[PDB]
Amino acid sequence: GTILIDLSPDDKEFQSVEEEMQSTVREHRDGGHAGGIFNRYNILKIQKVCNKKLWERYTHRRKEVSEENHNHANERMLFHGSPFVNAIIHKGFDERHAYIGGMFGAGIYFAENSSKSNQYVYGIGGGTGCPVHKDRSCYICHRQLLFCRVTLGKSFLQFSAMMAHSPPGHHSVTGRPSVNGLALAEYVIYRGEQAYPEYLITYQIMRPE
Ligand SMILES: Cc1cc(=O)[nH]c2cc(-c3ccc(C(=O)NCCN4CCOCC4)cc3Cl)ccc12
Ligand SMILES: [Zn+2]
């Protein structure tokens, strides 16, 4: 069902997606342990992900959520990093992408900070790092992240000191860091149909000068 269309670096759509990656890197409280040490990326490719069945599945859930929330989908563009990225772009998000031991409950996690999603590219906690060097901070191996369209609807706000159901009468959770004033939010959804993986971004983290 899925086709990938390469965006040209001269295309304005490529450029705003790259801007969103680059501008949302932050420092992490683990000193780079999970995702590596870097302030920016080398973007190698950005592809648009095109799958009619998945798209309709997404917009069908969206209209329902919309209707339950004063005609507001509360739709965002959020990052998602995962070792299952190739599986997500072909078959969609589902329970198997959920984070069972997640702090905001057992759903699928999305981040405003691209560098937060970068931490999960090689699995929970960075796993053992790139397949080739077992290096969580590998500067060589090509990584991939998804930049996804995510329906939040009524989102339950959970302040954090940083597949389950949504809390009653909510469509997602917002995990909002209250200690790190520079950390952006994470959001959790409990239905795969609430996210469409629009862009596949291939990149490397850059060693700082
Ligand atoms: C916060 C956040 C941001 C983000 O961008 N991406 C994330 C990804 C995950 C995530 C969730 C689950 C898994 C996984 O491996 N599940 C299977 C678990 N077991 C079960 C029994 O046997 C097989 C292994 C891997 C990842 Cl990377 C979590 C949080 C985020
Ligand atoms: Zn490597």
Which numbered atom of ligand 1 lies nearest the CA of 127?
A: 27
Tokens of 105: 């409950």
Mutational pocket test of ligand 1: of 28, 119, 120, the residue with most ligand atoms within 8 Å of the beta carbon: 120
Domains observed in the chain: 1-209 (3.90.228.10)
Q: Is 13 helix (H, G, I), strand (E, B) or coil?
A: helix
Question: Residue of the nearest CA to atom 6 in ligand 1?
Answer: 81
Stated in angstroms to one decimal place, the resolution of this structure is 2.1
Residue closest to 149 by CA, chosen among 84, 68, 57: 57
Ligand nearest to the CA of residue 121, numbered in listed order: 1
Cβ of 175 closer than 6 Å to ligand 1, yes or no, is no
Mutational pocket test of ligand 1: of 78, 79, 82, 187, the residue with most ligand atoms within 8 Å of the beta carbon: 82
Cβ of 112 closer than 6 Å to ligand 1, yes or no, is no
Pairing mode, strands 75-80 and 41-50 = unpaired
Residues composing the chain:
209
Phi first, then psi, for residue 76 (nearest 5°) are: -120, 170
Cα gap 173→157, rounded to integer Å = 6
Edge-to-edge strand list for the sheet holding 195-205 = 3-6, 41-50, 195-205, 143-151, 75-80, 108-111, 186-189, 172-177, 155-160
